[PDB]
Amino acid sequence: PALYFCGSIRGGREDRTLYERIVSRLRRFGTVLTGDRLIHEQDLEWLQQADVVVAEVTQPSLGVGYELGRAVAFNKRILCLFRPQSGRVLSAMIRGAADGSRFQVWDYEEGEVEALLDRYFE
Amino acid sequence: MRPALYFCGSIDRTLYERIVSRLRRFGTVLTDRLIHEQDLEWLQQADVVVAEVTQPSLGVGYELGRAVAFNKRILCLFRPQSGRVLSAMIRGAADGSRFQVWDYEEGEVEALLDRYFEADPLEENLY
Ligand SMILES: CC(C)c1ccc2c(c1)S(=O)(=O)N=C(Nc1cc(Cl)c(O)c(Cl)c1)N2
Numbered sequence A: 001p002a003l004y005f006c007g008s009i010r011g012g013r014e015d016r017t018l019y020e021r022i023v024s025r026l027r028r029f030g031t032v033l034t035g036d037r038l039i040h041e042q043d044l045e046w047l048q049q050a051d052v053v054v055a056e057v058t059q060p061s062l063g064v065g066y067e068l069g070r071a072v073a074f075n076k077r078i079l080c081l082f083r084p085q086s087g088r089v090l091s092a093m094i095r096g097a098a099d100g101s102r103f104q105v106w107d108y109e110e111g112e113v114e115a116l117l118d119r120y121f122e
Numbered sequence B: 001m002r003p004a005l006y007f008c009g010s011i012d013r014t015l016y017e018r019i020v021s022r023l024r025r026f027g028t029v030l031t032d033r034l035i036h037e038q039d040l041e042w043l044q045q046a047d048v049v050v051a052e053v054t055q056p057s058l059g060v061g062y063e064l065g066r067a068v069a070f071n072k073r074i075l076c077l078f079r080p081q082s083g084r085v086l087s088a089m090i091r092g093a094a095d096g097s098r099f100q101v102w103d104y105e106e107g108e109v110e111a112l113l114d115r116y117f118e119a120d121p122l123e124e125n126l127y
């Protein structure tokens, strides 16, 4: 299973450790795939190749959202991970895009992410 | 019907009102599961999608991604005077034709929107 993890740039520095925890945990279930035109074409290739797309959606990000819309149009299996303790309110578009099976949105607290990722792929 | 335009920006309030107001001169501006299906219906009906991408937004991102797979004609307007750096995934989605991303200043947005539709009209000019 090629697994695509997408996280924000701001979230890649603020939630840096958390993203690394997600990526290493994902590596137990499959192969983790992860100018501007180059960056774009490459992520798009990875999205099309992915068996599952995993997004951390706590940090509002244009790129992560864009990649989720591209993923939804490719009919990809998607898991979004959102942290309510942050105080943010997840965009109604992302939660509203959930269908509970192919597109799921899980609210979690940072300390249980390994257990939720095991639950998802087990 | 006059053409259908879709405006999307983050959930800067005066700026969005000025953009929607100016867009109404070119056609009908159309703009959790219920919110999602309605926005998707509106993206599919749009002859043109105009997104204000200054503020980071998963929702604005998602709609742009859906608009791209629907092959919608798209204009993204970004304010570099906000302080932010626009995501490489949005600048990178541009191709100069169908998907354009324009850097702008707040006072010229009406003039830029006239420039956008005068160069590629939705409805042609009267003789
Ligand atoms: C190392 C290789 C050459 C490489 C391959 C793919 C990518 C990169 C490097 S990157 O680290 O420069 N960034 C992206 N994607 C990206 C995704 C989102 Cl959601 C963003 O907001 C931004 Cl700015 C970029 N892809």
Ligand SMILES: CC(C)c1ccc2c(c1)S(=O)(=O)N=C(Nc1cc(Cl)c(O)c(Cl)c1)N2
Residues within 6 Å of the ligand: A090, A091, A092, A093, B008, B009, B010, B011, B035, B038, B039, B057, B058, B059, B060, B061, B063
């Ligand atoms: C008039 C009716 C009641 C109505 C129709 C469509 C929408 C709404 C109300 S709304 O004001 O609830 N929001 C959206 N879309 C939306 C788009 C983005 Cl990018 C977001 O981040 C969020 Cl949270 C929502 N559509």
